[PDB]
Design an enzyme around this catalytic site. Sequence first.
Site, PDB file in Angstrom:
ATOM      1  N   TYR A  79      70.783  -4.080 -10.806  1.00 38.12           N
ATOM      2  CA  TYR A  79      72.010  -3.671 -10.114  1.00 38.12           C
ATOM      3  C   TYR A  79      73.135  -3.116 -10.862  1.00 38.12           C
ATOM      4  O   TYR A  79      73.642  -1.955 -10.698  1.00 38.12           O
ATOM      5  CB  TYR A  79      72.645  -4.982  -9.105  1.00 38.12           C
ATOM      6  CG  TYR A  79      73.821  -4.777  -8.573  1.00 38.12           C
ATOM      7  CD1 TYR A  79      73.910  -3.971  -7.203  1.00 38.12           C
ATOM      8  CD2 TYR A  79      75.031  -5.570  -8.585  1.00 38.12           C
ATOM      9  CE1 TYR A  79      75.128  -4.195  -6.359  1.00 38.12           C
ATOM     10  CE2 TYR A  79      76.068  -5.289  -7.905  1.00 38.12           C
ATOM     11  CZ  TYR A  79      76.057  -4.841  -6.787  1.00 38.12           C
ATOM     12  OH  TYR A  79      77.242  -4.753  -5.982  1.00 38.12           O
TER      13      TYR A  79
ATOM     14  N   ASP B 100      83.127  -7.232   0.434  1.00 37.11           N
ATOM     15  CA  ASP B 100      84.137  -7.296  -0.750  1.00 37.11           C
ATOM     16  C   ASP B 100      85.508  -7.765  -0.354  1.00 37.11           C
ATOM     17  O   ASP B 100      85.606  -8.397   0.468  1.00 37.11           O
ATOM     18  CB  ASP B 100      83.925  -6.356  -1.933  1.00 37.11           C
ATOM     19  CG  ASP B 100      84.897  -4.789  -1.631  1.00 37.11           C
ATOM     20  OD1 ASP B 100      85.318  -4.704  -0.468  1.00 37.11           O
ATOM     21  OD2 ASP B 100      85.250  -3.905  -2.487  1.00 37.11           O
TER      22      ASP B 100
HETATM   23  C1  LIG Z   1      82.206  -4.099  -5.102  1.00 39.90           C
HETATM   24  C2  LIG Z   1      82.019  -4.291  -6.508  1.00 39.90           C
HETATM   25  C3  LIG Z   1      82.754  -5.479  -7.152  1.00 39.90           C
HETATM   26  C4  LIG Z   1      84.066  -5.266  -6.928  1.00 39.90           C
HETATM   27  C5  LIG Z   1      84.385  -3.701  -7.270  1.00 39.90           C
HETATM   28  C6  LIG Z   1      83.761  -2.734  -7.625  1.00 39.90           C
HETATM   29  C7  LIG Z   1      83.995  -1.476  -8.076  1.00 39.90           C
HETATM   30  C8  LIG Z   1      85.494  -1.151  -7.620  1.00 39.90           C
HETATM   31  C9  LIG Z   1      86.352  -1.812  -7.576  1.00 39.90           C
HETATM   32  C10 LIG Z   1      87.863  -1.722  -7.598  1.00 39.90           C
HETATM   33  C11 LIG Z   1      88.796  -2.611  -7.214  1.00 39.90           C
HETATM   34  O1  LIG Z   1      90.037  -2.484  -7.069  1.00 39.90           O
HETATM   35  C12 LIG Z   1      88.326  -4.095  -6.845  1.00 39.90           C
HETATM   36  C13 LIG Z   1      86.893  -4.365  -6.882  1.00 39.90           C
HETATM   37  C14 LIG Z   1      85.679  -3.419  -7.224  1.00 39.90           C
HETATM   38  C15 LIG Z   1      82.265  -3.199  -7.483  1.00 39.90           C
HETATM   39  C16 LIG Z   1      81.119  -2.035  -7.121  1.00 39.90           C
HETATM   40  C17 LIG Z   1      79.936  -3.094  -7.029  1.00 39.90           C
HETATM   41  C18 LIG Z   1      80.473  -4.415  -6.801  1.00 39.90           C
HETATM   42  O2  LIG Z   1      79.322  -5.304  -6.813  1.00 39.90           O
END
Ligand SMILES: C[C@]12CCc3c(ccc4cc(O)ccc34)[C@@H]1CCC2=O
Lengths: 120, 123
Positions: free
Chosen positions: B14, B38
């Site tokens: 992943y 999320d």
């Molecule tokens: C969603 C996520 C965890 C949190 C997160 C991601 C990407 C961009 C982010 C930007 C943010 O401001 C806060 C959290 C995320 C990841 C993409 C893959 C994943 O598991």
Amino acid sequence: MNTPEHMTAVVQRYVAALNAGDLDGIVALFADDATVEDEPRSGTAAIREFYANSLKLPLAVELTQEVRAVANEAAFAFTVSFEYQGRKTVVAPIDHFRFNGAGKVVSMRALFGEKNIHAG
Amino acid sequence: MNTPEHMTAVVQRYVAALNAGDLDGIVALFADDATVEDGGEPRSGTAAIREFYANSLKLPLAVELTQEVRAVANEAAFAFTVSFEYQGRKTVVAPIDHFRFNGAGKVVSMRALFGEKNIHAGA
Ligand SMILES: C[C@]12CCc3c(ccc4cc(O)ccc34)[C@@H]1CCC2=O
Ligand SMILES: C[C@]12CCc3c(ccc4cc(O)ccc34)[C@@H]1CCC2=O
């Protein structure tokens, strides 16, 4: 909804009471109807007994990163270490707390598998 | 029951897929009817999960596992960072993610947990 500050302070109090061997202090963080898991034990008596069994050996506990607190939940990475009959073990779980409206922990789940138990 | 080895491999795969911008490789980890969530409802099913990850991948990500995976029963949780930059401004987010797996070894739910204090402005 709980504040992230409050949930984060509770996680630190939980770690502190573990390190001090303060059984009263651990249980006081939980709701009357909380469950704990790492048989899912429920209610104040079962919770106290769960922690009393853990605390038969002095535990060294350390948060190993910042707490993640959002909504009514907190997750945290940590280690718990104990030394007995000439052997040190370090267990590295991730714990997830759910909190009720009154700010008490209504469920804790400590997630770890065999590869997270280190006998060094 | 899932093996912890399999679950741990899937978490690593992943992370790699995110770093490679491999959208289909990410979506392939999930069951047909999986959910993502999320930090006002979870996204459900393949098309919604694909859309969720396609939107995340609009910026180049550098994802790193920062501790060993926790895998047990049909679940895994993991600590990691996600780093990105937009218009010269860097962000490092530090979430904890949790996967549940079905019997076929596919992910049936992912939850990403992070709050404001877990979003770090500056590199
Ligand atoms: C969603 C996520 C965890 C949190 C997160 C991601 C990407 C961009 C982010 C930007 C943010 O401001 C806060 C959290 C995320 C990841 C993409 C893959 C994943 O598991
Ligand atoms: C249950 C626990 C996490 C796991 C754990 C503890 C104590 C001793 C243990 C011994 C083990 O062989 C495996 C796991 C634990 C912690 C005490 C407080 C806590 O959250």
